Write a protein that binds this ligand. Sequence first.
Ligand SMILES: Nc1nc2c(ncn2[C@@H]2O[C@H](COP(=O)(O)OP(=O)(O)NP(=O)(O)O)[C@@H](O)[C@H]2O)c(=O)[nH]1
Ligand SMILES: [Mg+2]
Ligand SMILES: [Mg+2]
Length: 164
Amino acid sequence: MTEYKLVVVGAGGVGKSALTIQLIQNHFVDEYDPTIEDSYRKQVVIDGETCLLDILDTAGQYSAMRDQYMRTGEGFLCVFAINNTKSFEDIHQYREQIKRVKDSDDVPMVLVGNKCDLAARTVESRQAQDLARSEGIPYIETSAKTRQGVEDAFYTLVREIRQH
Ligand SMILES: Nc1nc2c(ncn2[C@@H]2O[C@H](COP(=O)(O)OP(=O)(O)NP(=O)(O)O)[C@@H](O)[C@H]2O)c(=O)[nH]1
Ligand SMILES: [Mg+2]
Ligand SMILES: [Mg+2]
């Protein structure tokens, strides 16, 4: 079957793992558990097509160790947290590193604003929007906790790969 090589990147603690675990294991981790590098492979049906999601869950903490997984990566979830301004700034750097490593500014990518269940927001949707719009990528807000937007985000990425 068709495989889609997805890579989840972003600053430490933004909820990259929680997002992936919600998608694959239908629950919210709700705990401290930093990632080194984890891989999930799940057979799904998206828009009637059987496919294998091969998802790489990466470290927000291993910078030269990033090139290799960006090289093979097919599409990228670029995650920040809407209560964490710094993480939104960092996500600029992730995108630039992906573009550089892959020698392309045409790599399938979704900008993800996670933790949208939290009231104490510090990153307005509008600024994330403008940034996404500027870069030619979709913007989707998620809550790994309530599952809001989680399938939207991952499936949109898959469709962005099919549309490439
Ligand atoms: N309220 C809320 N908390 C979330 C959400 N996603 C993750 N968290 C919480 O935020 C923390 C970080 O989650 P985690 O998934 O480990 O982040 P990460 O980006 O994978 N971290 P790392 O880069 O170190 O692997 C945990 O306490 C987790 O339960 C979310 O959507 N909402
Ligand atoms: Mg993690
Ligand atoms: Mg559930």
